[PDB]
Amino acid sequence: GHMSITENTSWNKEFSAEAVNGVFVLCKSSSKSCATNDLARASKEYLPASTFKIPNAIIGLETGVIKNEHQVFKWDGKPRAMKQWERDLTLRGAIQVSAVPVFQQITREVGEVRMQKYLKKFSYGNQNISGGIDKFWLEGQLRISAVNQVEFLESLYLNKLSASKENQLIVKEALVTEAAPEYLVHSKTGFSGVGTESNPGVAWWVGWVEKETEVYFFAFNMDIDNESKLPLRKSIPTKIMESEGIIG
Amino acid sequence: GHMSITENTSWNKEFSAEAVNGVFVLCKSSSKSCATNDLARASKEYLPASTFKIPNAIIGLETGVIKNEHQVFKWDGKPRAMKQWERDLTLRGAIQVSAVPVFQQITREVGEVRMQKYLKKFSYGNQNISGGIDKFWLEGQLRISAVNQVEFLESLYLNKLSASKENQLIVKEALVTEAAPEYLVHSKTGFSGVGTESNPGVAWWVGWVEKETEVYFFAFNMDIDNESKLPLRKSIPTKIMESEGIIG
Numbered sequence: 001g002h003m004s005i006t007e008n009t010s011w012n013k014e015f016s017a018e019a020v021n022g023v024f025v026l027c028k029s030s031s032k033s034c035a036t037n038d039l040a041r042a043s044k045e046y047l048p049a050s051t052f053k054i055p056n057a058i059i060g061l062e063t064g065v066i067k068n069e070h071q072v073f074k075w076d077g078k079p080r081a082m083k084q085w086e087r088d089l090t091l092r093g094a095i096q097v098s099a100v101p102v103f104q105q106i107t108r109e110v111g112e113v114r115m116q117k118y119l120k121k122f123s124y125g126n127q128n129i130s131g132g133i134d135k136f137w138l139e140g141q142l143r144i145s146a147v148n149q150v151e152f153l154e155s156l157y158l159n160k161l162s163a164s165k166e167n168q169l170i171v172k173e174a175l176v177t178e179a180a181p182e183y184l185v186h187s188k189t190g191f192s193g194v195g196t197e198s199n200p201g202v203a204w205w206v207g208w209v210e211k212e213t214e215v216y217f218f219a220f221n222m223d224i225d226n227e228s229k230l231p232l233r234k235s236i237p238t239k240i241m242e243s244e245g246i247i248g
Numbered sequence: 249g250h251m252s253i254t255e256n257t258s259w260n261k262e263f264s265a266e267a268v269n270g271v272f273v274l275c276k277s278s279s280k281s282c283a284t285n286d287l288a289r290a291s292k293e294y295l296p297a298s299t300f301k302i303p304n305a306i307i308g309l310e311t312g313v314i315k316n317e318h319q320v321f322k323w324d325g326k327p328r329a330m331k332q333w334e335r336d337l338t339l340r341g342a343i344q345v346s347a348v349p350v351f352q353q354i355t356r357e358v359g360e361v362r363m364q365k366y367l368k369k370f371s372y373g374n375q376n377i378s379g380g381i382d383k384f385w386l387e388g389q390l391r392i393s394a395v396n397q398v399e400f401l402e403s404l405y406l407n408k409l410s411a412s413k414e415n416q417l418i419v420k421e422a423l424v425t426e427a428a429p430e431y432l433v434h435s436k437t438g439f440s441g442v443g444t445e446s447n448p449g450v451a452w453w454v455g456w457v458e459k460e461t462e463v464y465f466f467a468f469n470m471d472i473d474n475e476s477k478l479p480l481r482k483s484i485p486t487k488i489m490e491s492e493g494i495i496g
């Protein structure tokens with residue numbers, strides 16, 4: 001890439017106030033104007049968890065495993081790890097409620113060869129898909145940094161991923177999470193569970209904010225060993241952006 | 249063709265409770281299952297006012313007058329009728345604040361001949377562009393019915409207009425007005441003025457609502473001779489959609 005990134009450790013106070021280890025990366029306009037609380041962690045690769053839905057959906061559409069933007073994913077009737085997943089879902093619905101089994105099925109149908117090819121085209125992390133075709137991003141070896149998430153998202157925002165513009169637009173449509181006349185947020189959450197206290201889990205929030213004629217890309221991750229701390233994955237980024245002029 | 253529509257006069261309740269003459273057309277899934285409070289008014293053509301920004305944006309992109317979805321429409325610093333228009337705007341921003349001068353400039357560049365052609369391809373209303381390029385949707389002869397709006401919007405939803413899929417997708421993202429995990433609204437307003445008591449203006453609200461795996465298309469218009477009545481263009485459709493269990 002061509003990222004210019006500045007460490008601003010004053011951003012650490014939002015983390016230390018909550019007794020949390022993580023990083024926030026925030027870029028205005030492009031990856032040529034970025035800042036983070038922690039340069040080292042910004043470039044450190046973690047398990048993507050549900051953030052992998054963004055590339056998975058694009059790859060689904062590119063390969064034709066997902067037939068089109070209007071496809072419904074029907075619940076077969078058999079139980080699932082969350083109740084919110086026990087229903088028929090659109091592409092957007094599945095992404096928004098973060099329905100893992102829908103996406104495990106897409107990936108099985110895609111196959112390792114095509115998966116491997118596309119993660120190379122997207123420069124997605126360490127591009128290591130071993131661990132099982134249906135769980136490399138969930139408990140396998142695939143890892144990605146906050147910096148790389150931002151680069152990836154920027155490419156998607158600009159329709160520069162190696163995929164049709166149509167497919168990128170379909171997925172961007174699925175990622176909208178807040179809409180107002182001159183304020184638009186596209187975003188995706190992730191959470192791997194609580195791991196242990198020796199080896200904590202990871203929580204993510206990644207996306208971008210449009211406000212007037214500006215765009216801001218962001219990626220946040222944190223170590224999480226306690227499910228009660230999970231709200232911080234939005235409140236910390238929100239507070240940093242408030243203090244910068246974005247959400248405030 | 250192919251619309252099936254039912255008159256349900258119980259929907260007149262919300263209209264007469266506010267002393268308003270108007271029509272609501274609501275369709276579930278497709279134009280094969282529609283209902284309205286007034287069949288004759290459903291098919292009557294009125295000037296589209298700011299709802300014309302939907303086709304106008306598609307045509308802008310199709311002819312290359314709008315370069316892409318990231319184009320910024322710069323303000324020249326000279327007065328505009330609305331304070332909210334006195335700033336640089338994205339395409340989505342210009343649509344959402346209904347920035348008439350941005351779209352007048354788009355229309356001027358498109359020209360009469362190209363405008364005519366796309367209104368024909370879209371079956372948009374009486375397809376009448378007479379009066380001069382500086383007035384037809386405004387001080388002009390173009391008129392469209394609520395039924396024809398619902399047909400137009402269904403085509404757009406299905407990416408079936410005669411326009412690239414990517415241009416239709418661009419315009420759809422510009423139209424999003426509420427986003428939640430399993431509830432998505434795309435909508436546009438219009439208001440032509442107060443006219444006279446004898447010749448009222450028109451106000452519109454058109455769009456569609458995605459809920460779970462269903463879609464509902466809607467178009468509302470009403471006669472308006474008093475600006476204080478304007479909010480009814482949202483509250484009356486809202487009430488009817490609530491009573492049908494949609495607004496959830």
Ligand SMILES: *C(=O)[C@H](NC(=O)/C(=N/OC(C)(C)C(=O)O)c1csc(N)n1)[C@@H]1NC(C(=O)O)=C(C[n+]2ccccc2)CS1
Nearest residue numbers: 297298299332344345346348385386387437438439440441
């Ligand atoms: C589009 O429907 C409206 N455009 C018009 O240009 C007309 N406006 O008439 C009013 C605003 C009443 C006036 O005093 O000029 C018009 C005249 S002849 C014709 N065909 N159209 C825009 N609509 C609109 C609204 O729907 O409420 C406006 C106010 N908003 C601005 C920003 C956000 C929401 C609403 C401004 S013009």
Ligand SMILES: *C(=O)[C@H](NC(=O)/C(=N\OC(C)(C)C(=O)O)c1csc(N)n1)[C@@H]1NC(C(=O)O)=C(C[n+]2ccccc2)CS1
Nearest residue numbers: 048049050051081098100137138139189190191192193194
């Ligand atoms: C995708 O990142 C999320 N993760 C999972 O499905 C995984 N674990 O989910 C648990 C531990 C919460 C569970 O028991 O269901 C998982 C394990 S290892 C791995 N890579 N993923 C979905 N995301 C998500 C979120 O990102 O916030 C959810 C929110 N949530 C969690 C718990 C309680 C209420 C809401 C749902 S799971």
